[PDB]
Design a protein around this ligand. Structure first.
Ligand SMILES: O=C(O)c1ccc(-c2nn(C(=O)c3c(Cl)cccc3C(F)(F)F)c3ccccc23)cc1
Ligand SMILES: O=C(O)c1ccc(-c2nn(C(=O)c3c(Cl)cccc3C(F)(F)F)c3ccccc23)cc1
Lengths: 257, 251
């Protein structure tokens, strides 16, 4: 509720974000824009085969990539969970609620941060050692030629706000501490925390992007688009489960819906 | 420009009063007993009130909704700058906007136990609405759940007038030809809305943020309604009547 308290809250979260997420947006942009480090580019199947001898990927093609993308998701859930521990008040909440906040929250956060790794033309993979193009992913077979595209569409819009990491660290906390999750036992203390985080985000954006009229409101409006991407991904995953499939214990739990 | 924001705000509340016959203030007075409405809680109650059922109620809610679209279209005329936008862009904004607004404004007629109907001359219970045939009676409850959360923000008409304008001027609707002027207008509205909530609810921390957060839930509920409406079109044949009427009320 005090300006210096809010700046303090912001530094705390930026700190834990740096410590919890190995690839920041600043590091990714440096790789993406050529600033002094350059990735191997995957645009076709021969490039894909060429990639393994260069990067440590692959841990039928469209399947190896989907499963590889899912294995990457398990890491993302782990990093997000670590970051969330350090949000003031989160570990004090009721255990069930802590679990529920993570249940719905991780996917919206993965896609928020996946935007840090993308441009119009493709996405960084394997901790920035590779770069897979959108048209290659778009051209994958069966239902897999479509799981990545709506992420690209969001990112292009999302990256237009030019947020930096110190902006994102607070935004991510706001996503987790949302009292509208299905099944929360005690909404009042969850919401109380978000008043603090929203207050910090409001000031952080005013200071960091003072020329950006209504960035705060515009950034919150983006939570609408995040929700829509998660709906589609959960549905496309119930289709794979019945066709081939054959899901990490972490992924098994987040997929109860 | 604080005076500009208070000026913009009083303008819309003025126009909103003139465009929408049943305000939230007026509806809340009727809900609380502060002329009592006819209450529909069962099937015999329905037959007596006017002077297959689940379809008659759905069709009745749509005919009512189409009346509100004309009222919303008129209110949008009064948003400063809106009539100067490209006509194509105006149609597109209303096309995608009306649903979110109809749901926003439906919450003013709603409480835990039911909803005002026919300009406040009736009251339909939620316990009646919850229990309808499998396809129907399931498009309703998510509205009630939304409203209760929404009505907990305790907004009044002068808040909603600006909130409604904000929905209308969303520069992300598919097919917009010229987004800059739409967004420039929406900046003014958000500034005006922000000021409105601080003055009106000086004790309500971060209400502005909380209200914008609700637009996430509005989009999700409209999506679901758009989905259930693709199901009735292919499954329910009795929803035919005059071909002209299907033409009038399809939207
Ligand atoms: O080193 C590896 O084995 C490997 C390492 C990474 C990938 C891979 N990750 N990914 C992502 O989308 C991703 C990223 Cl890049 C970072 C964090 C979270 C994600 C998440 F959304 F999947 F959860 C992809 C998309 C498309 C194609 C390949 C990949 C694949 C393989
Ligand atoms: O003012 C009125 O007479 C009135 C006005 C609205 C309702 C009402 N409509 N509704 C719908 O789901 C609905 C339907 Cl079913 C068809 C088309 C459009 C809608 C819409 F309003 F949501 F947009 C509801 C659900 C739950 C509770 C009350 C209602 C009822 C009465």
């Amino acid at each position: 509720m005090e300006s210096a308290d809010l700046r303090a809250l912001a530094k705390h979260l930026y700190d834990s974000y740096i410590k919890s997420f190995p690839l920041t947006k600043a590091k990714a942009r440096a790789i993406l824009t050529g600033k002094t480090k350059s990735p191997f580019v995957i645009y076709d199947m021969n490039s894909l085969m060429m990639g393994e001898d260069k990067i440590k990927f692959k841990h039928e093609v469209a399947i190896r990539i989907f499963q590889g993308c899912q294995f990457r998701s398990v890491e993302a859930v782990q990093e997000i969970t670590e970051y969330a521990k350090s949000i003031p008040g989160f570990v004090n909440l009721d255990l069930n609620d802590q679990v529920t906040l993570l249940k719905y929250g991780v996917h919206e956060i993965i896609y928020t941060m996946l935007a840090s790794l993308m441009n119009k033309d493709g996405v960084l993979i394997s901790e920035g050692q590779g770069f897979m193009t959108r048209e290659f992913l778009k051209s994958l077979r069966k239902p897999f030629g479509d799981f990545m595209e709506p992420k690209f569409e969001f990112a292009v819009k999302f990256n237009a706000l030019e947020l930096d990491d110190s902006d994102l660290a607070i935004f991510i906390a706001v996503i987790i501490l949302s009292g509208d999750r299905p099944g929360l036992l005690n909404v009042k203390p969850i919401e109380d925390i978000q008043d603090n985080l929203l207050q910090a985000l409001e000031l952080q954006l005013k200071l960091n992007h003072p020329e950006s009229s209504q960035l705060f409101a515009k950034l919150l409006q983006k939570m609408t688009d995040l929700r829509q991407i998660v709906t589609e991904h959960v549905q496309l995953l119930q289709v794979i489960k019945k066709t081939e499939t054959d899901l990490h214990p972490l992924l098994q739990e987040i997929y109860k819906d």
